[PDB]
Structures are given as structure tokens and as C-alpha cells.
């Protein structure tokens, strides 16, 4: 009963159509957030909902990392750790990657073009590979 | 890097509140849902604590999904109990704090929340020998 993208005019399916390879690495997203928007990230401002989403994603994923470390330390059985860390890192982190890329892109170029990029990418992917144009559309600037 | 900064509060200001005197999870869930479902469901975008609560509920949903998945697989029975107990007890303190804060401001007004939060620090500091019997409630 929650549509996080509904507050910006997008829906879950729009991003769900996006394959996993397209999103960057988590380290890349964190480094971008640190380097390019640190000054105003901590400062207080009105509106700017994207700032609030980024701030809460960073806390959520920090808490997840703390969980990973805590399970690594204790957890005496030797095997479980592999499965636990795999599920925590690769599977659960997909949503974090999903949200971080969406909001970071929204901040740099705004809703005006990201939505069109999404609809165009969906149109490109839906068709079969045989008649698909050479390369995937690029967001560009 | 600061959970609340932009509400005129600090993580150190909430320290005075003891961990035990918080409310239970399901109560905050119900209090938010029943009262402010309509507020959740609107096209208007303002008071970012709305979105903040939307992030908190999403995080809780993800954690519950992890809990059920662990309940499903994970062959040692114990490790399972240890993980379930940890996720239930230790993992929810921060979310509970967030829900309390946002509901409080969401219910009445910010200034009333900031007053209650600085005053409640008085209660713990005073000694029981001459401390007043009752503690301060948010009221309205």
C-alpha cells in the first residue's frame, strides 16, 4: 500500500523494467553522494525531498553494514555466514541501489527528463532483440 | 549522517530519554496508520516527515521479509532463534525512535514536541527522594 515513486510521478514498474546491470555499484553511489552533494546534504533547507530520501537511505544501508559485521563476528557455525552475507549484500542491496540511482539522477537533471528517459528505455526493451536498434538509449544531458 | 538534524533536534538531545520508556512497535504502527492513512495518501508533497515515515515503514517491511525468509530456510534451529531474537529486539530501537518522533510532530505541532523533549530530561535527573511523583506527558 506504499508507492514511493508516486510522490514524484513514477511507478515501481518503471524501474523494475530496468535490468540489474544498468545500476552502478554501491560504492560508486556512496562516493557520488559524498563528493558532489555533501555541502548542502547536512545543511537545512525546505522542500528538496530528494535530500531526505538520500539521507535515510545512507542510514539504512549503514545499519545493514553493521548487521553484516555483527553476524560475521559471532555466528559460530562456519557455513551459514556465506548464505547470510550473500543475501544481505547482493539481494537486499538491490533496492538500495535502485533508490539511490533514482534520487541521485533526479537531483542532477530533475524530473523533466528522467521520466522520458525511463519511458523510452521501456519502449526499447519491450521489443524483441531481433528488431531492437543497435544500442540502448543514453540519458545524456 | 545525522538522523534528525533538520528538525531542530540532535541525537544527543534524545539520549536523555531512556531506551525502556519508549512505546511498543505495533502501537506506533497502528497509531500512524489509523490516524494518518489519509495524510499518507495524497498528491501534495510537503512536511518531509511524511516521506520519512514512508521510508521507516519500508525499512520495517524489508526487515520483516528477511525475518520470514530466515524462518523458512537456515537449517540449524538455534542460529535461527538467535537471529530472530536479535531482529525482533535489538534491531527495532532506531525505527521505534523515528516513529515516535515523527508521529509526535505529526500529531500536534513541532514546538510542543521540542518543549516536551527538553522538559522530560528534568524528570530523570532529579533524585527520587524529592522528585515529583508523576512524569511529563506530551498532552494536547
Amino acid at each position: 500500500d506504499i508507492d514511493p515513486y508516486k510522490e514524484f510521478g513514477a511507478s515501481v514498474e518503471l524501474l523494475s523494467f530496468l535490468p540489474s546491470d544498468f545500476f552502478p555499484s554501491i560504492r560508486d553511489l556512496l562516493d557520488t553522494a559524498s563528493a558532489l552533494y555533501r555541502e548542502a546534504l547536512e545543511s537545512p533547507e525546505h522542500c528538496s525531498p530528494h535530500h531526505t530520501a538520500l539521507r535515510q537511505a545512507i542510514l539504512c544501508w549503514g545499519e545493514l553494514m553493521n548487521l553484516a559485521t555483527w553476524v560475521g563476528s559471532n555466528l559460530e557455525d562456519p557455513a551459514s555466514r556465506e548464505l547470510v552475507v550473500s543475501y544481505v549484500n547482493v539481494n537486499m542491496g538491490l533496492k538500495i541501489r535502485q533508490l539511490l540511482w533514482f534520487h541521485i539522477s533526479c537531483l542532477t537533471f530533475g524530473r523533466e527528463t528522467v521520466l522520458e528517459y525511463l519511458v523510452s528505455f521501456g519502449v526499447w526493451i519491450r521489443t524483441p532483440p531481433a528488431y531492437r536498434p543497435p544500442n540502448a538509449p543514453i540519458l545524456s544531458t | 549522517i545525522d538522523p534528525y538534524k533538520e528538525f531542530g533536534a540532535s541525537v544527543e538531545l534524545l539520549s536523555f530519554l531512556p531506551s525502556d520508556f519508549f512505546p511498543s512497535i505495533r502501537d506506533l504502527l497502528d497509531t500512524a496508520s489509523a490516524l494518518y492513512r489519509e495524510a499518507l495518501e495524497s498528491p501534495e508533497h510537503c512536511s518531509p516527515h511524511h516521506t520519512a515515515l514512508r521510508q521507516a515503514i519500508l525499512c520495517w517491511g524489508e526487515l520483516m521479509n528477511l525475518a520470514t525468509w530466515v524462518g523458512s530456510n537456515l537449517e540449524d534451529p538455534a542460529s535461527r532463534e538467535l537471529v530472530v531474537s536479535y531482529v525482533n529486539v535489538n534491531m527495532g530501537l532506531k525505527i521505534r525512535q523515528l516513529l515516535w518522533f515523527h508521529i509526535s510532530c505529526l500529531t500536534f505541532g513541532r514546538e510542543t514536541v521540542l518543549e516536551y523533549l527538553v522538559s522530560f530530561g528534568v524528570w530523570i535527573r532529579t533524585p527520587p527522594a524529592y522528585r515529583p511523583p508523576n512524569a511529563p506527558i506530551l498532552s494536547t
Partner: antibody, heavy 119, light 113 residues
Framework: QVQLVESGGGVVQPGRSLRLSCAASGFNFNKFGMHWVRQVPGKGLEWLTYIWYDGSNADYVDSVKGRFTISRDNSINTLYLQMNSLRADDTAVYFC????????????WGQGALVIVSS | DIVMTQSPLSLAVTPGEPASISCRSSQTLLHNNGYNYFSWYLQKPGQAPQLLIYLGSNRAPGVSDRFSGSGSGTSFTLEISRVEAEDVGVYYCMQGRHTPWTFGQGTKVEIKR
């Protein structure tokens, strides 16, 4: 309930080396560890070695350190314990077991097999 | 590495009376999970060993309630409320805090002549 049956036990001439067979079925071998237990008559149980599911790591006790080795073949789900440089103090019945109460104490114990050396 | 210890070595019980056996370990077994890694085993002549208590204070599945134990840290005790004729055997305690694993010395029970 899982049932494990060993094989290969018997008498061996002194100075040679022997290999014992311990196969298991009815549970996920790839998801649990294995252990070796020994009992010479007159004393109690003694721990020898163990191997993890992957098999990359292993441990040994000082009594047989560097002279025994253990390996597993996940294709057929069978345990293996190799014995070299056998001595008169090694005459005992050998048991292979499995532990799953959070990786601490053994749960199901095999029937075991006795190994005897003499001329 | 760990030195194990058991006492008393022998204990003959008139059956129908309670009895207690004590096993002691040198190094503490309280891990950071609030659990203690200690075991209770039962061994019968001509048979494979069987489990008595698991994780220090939890009964192994299928074991009768007649056996109970508790304790923490470096001290533990095995208690049997009522002794039955089928309870004769040699009992063991084991350690699983740090590798390598070490066993105790044993405790055999019988009937007082």
C-alpha cells in the same frame, strides 16, 4: 532420521597404511560438517579432527598432527579418512558423526568400525 | 589446550533417588551470544553414544524429562530426579569453545551392592 554405515574396517599388517570408509545419506551433506571420534579400550572418547563444508580449512590434534588427512567428495556424499604411519597405540574403533546444534555438539553417531594391528 | 575435569569418578545410586554429577572446565564458555558451549553425552556398552543435554541447558530432542541440568560459566551439574534400571552407563562432558575439541574423563554409574 539419518542412517550412516561405515566400511573398510579390519586387521592390517604393521607398517602399512589403511583407509576407512564412512558414507552418509538422507540429509544435505553440503550444508553440514563432519567429525571423527576414536576409542581405544580402557579409556573414553577422544576428538581427532574435523572438516568444514567447503573443505578449504581443516584442523588436527597434536597426537596425529601431520600424519592423518581427511577429505570429502561432494559428488557422492562420502567421507574419507586416510591413515599413514600407524603405531601400536592407534588400535581402536573409529566413529564418524555429524553435529548441527549450532555447530557445537555431535548429534547423530555412526555405528563405527574397529581397526586392529598385529603380526 | 583446554584441561577438562570431572567428579566424582563413580557414583552408585539406589534407584528411585536423585543424584548429581559435576563437570568443570578451565576457561570460560560464555560467548558474546549469551550462550555457553557445553555438552552432556550418554554411552552404553556395545552401542553408539547418545545425547543428553544440548547448548548447556536445553534438552536434546526425544530425551526423557528425568534428566535435567543447569549452570553457567565454568561450573555445571547434571541432575537425574529418578534413577531407572535402564540408566546404567558411563557419562561424558565435552567442550566446544575453541578448537581443538577436548573430552572429559568419564563417570560410570552402577547399583550400590
Amino acid at each position: 532420521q539419518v542412517q550412516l554405515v561405515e566400511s573398510g574396517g579390519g586387521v592390517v599388517q604393521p607398517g602399512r597404511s589403511l583407509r576407512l570408509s564412512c558414507a552418509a545419506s538422507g540429509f544435505n551433506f553440503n550444508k553440514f560438517g563432519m567429525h571423527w571420534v576414536r576409542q581405544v579400550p580402557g579409556k573414553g572418547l577422544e576428538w581427532l579432527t574435523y572438516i568444514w563444508y567447503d573443505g578449504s580449512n581443516a584442523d588436527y590434534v597434536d597426537s596425529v598432527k601431520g600424519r592423518f588427512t581427511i577429505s570429502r567428495d561432494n559428488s557422492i556424499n562420502t567421507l574419507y579418512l586416510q591413515m599413514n604411519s600407524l603405531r601400536a597405540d592407534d588400535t581402536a574403533v573409529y566413529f564418524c558423526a555429524r553435529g548441527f546444534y549450532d555447530s557445537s555438539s555431535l548429534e547423530s553417531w555412526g555405528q563405527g568400525a574397529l581397526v586392529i594391528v598385529s603380526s | 589446550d583446554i584441561v577438562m575435569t570431572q567428579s566424582p569418578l563413580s557414583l552408585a545410586v539406589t534407584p528411585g533417588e536423585p543424584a548429581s554429577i559435576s563437570c568443570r572446565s578451565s576457561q570460560t564458555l560464555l560467548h558474546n551470544n549469551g550462550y555457553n558451549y557445553f555438552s552432556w553425552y550418554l554411552q552404553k556398552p556395545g552401542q553408539a553414544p547418545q545425547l543428553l543435554i544440548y547448548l548447556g541447558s536445553n534438552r536434546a530432542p526425544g530425551v526423557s524429562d528425568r534428566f535435567s541440568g543447569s549452570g553457567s560459566g565454568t561450573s555445571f551439574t547434571l541432575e537425574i530426579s529418578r534413577v531407572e534400571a535402564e540408566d546404567v552407563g558411563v557419562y561424558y562432558c565435552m567442550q566446544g569453545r575453541h578448537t581443538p575439541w577436548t573430552f572429559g574423563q568419564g563417570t560410570k554409574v552402577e547399583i550400590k551392592r
